[PDB]
């Protein structure tokens, strides 16, 4: 089960893993599946290929991933991002995140403002931040 999926994909991608920058390696694999979703369009059908993608990417760049096994050291980090990572908003990430999972139900409404869950995440995040500093 786990070995058949690993050894099969490892032997094919090993040549382009050690040489290619893991930042470009992910970006290509991501833009491709994004266009595989626009050709096919089932959402549970689409969770199946992505979830089998998540497991292999973990085998590859996760702890002890074939990458960390090939190269020692390596703090992690597949890309350093300037300005854009500092300028990306959580509220915008949530709305896009909700666009894929909400689907039907409460409409997006105006920018800012949250559903019940968004507020629970935002406050739990804001609460755990001010208490840990104590």
């Amino acid at each position, epitope marked *: 089960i786990f070995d058949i999926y690993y050894k099969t994909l490892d032997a094919i991608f090993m040549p382009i893993i050690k*040489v*290619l*920058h893991p930042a*470009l390696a992910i970006l290509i694999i991501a833009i491709i599946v994004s266009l595989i979703i626009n050709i096919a369009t089932p959402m549970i059908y689409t969770w199946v290929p992505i979830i089998l993608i998540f497991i292999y990417l973990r085998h590859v760049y996760g702890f002890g991933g074939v990458y960390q096994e090939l*190269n*020692p*050291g*390596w*703090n*992690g*980090v597949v890309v*350093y991002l300037p300005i854009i990572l500092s300028k990306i908003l959580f509220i915008d990430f949530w709305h896009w995140l909700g666009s894929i999972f909400y689907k039907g139900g409460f409409k997006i409404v105006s920018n800012t403002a949250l559903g019940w869950l968004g507020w629970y995440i935002l406050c739990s995040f804001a609460t755990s931040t001010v208490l840990r500093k104590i």
Partner: antibody
Amino acid sequence: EVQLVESGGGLVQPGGSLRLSCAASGFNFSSSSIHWVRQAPGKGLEWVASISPSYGYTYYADSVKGRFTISADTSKNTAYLQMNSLRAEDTAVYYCARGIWSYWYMVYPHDNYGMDYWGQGTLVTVSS
Amino acid sequence: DIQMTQSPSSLSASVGDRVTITCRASQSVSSAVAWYQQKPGKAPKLLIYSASSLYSGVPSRFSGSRSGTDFTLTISSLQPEDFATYYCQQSSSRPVTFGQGTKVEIKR
């Protein structure tokens, strides 16, 4: 307005240990790779170890492998070279060198292409 | 392991002459090779990288070339400040390896 300052050289008994530091200034330490290259007295250049801060890759030579540990502190803007089980043949001047970087790095990491800037090095003598 | 055999070991030229140094790789390597100039008691400096790319500040009097596995450094018109030992490095594979060195001297 760039430079690298090695330090920590001196006489050491065989089987001891010494620790060299490379203080860099004038360029981006987080990006450019750092390299250690030693030159035995009267001989040519020899490659000891290379490291890439940020990504944290470590590259050692079969000569110093196991006795030498290279590291870099991004917050201090310095690259350290730890030397254990020093032997008589390791005596030489130790140059700290910055790798030279081309945009092809972005597509491919791990490519040296050369050394751009070399510190004047620090002398290390191992003898009783 | 890769070895780089550089020749000749030493040579005596004169001002205005044309010097040629050859660095032969042991096996197939990329076009990424560097040529270094080292004055006596000084740190090595970079002249040519990628075999053919001239490094900034280095006068056009210097130049590299790639013939198969034989990389070559060429000083068109030798100058008084160009006298020193020259090394050739292959950075296309690990471990990195340098050349034995070429010692250039004036003739009088």
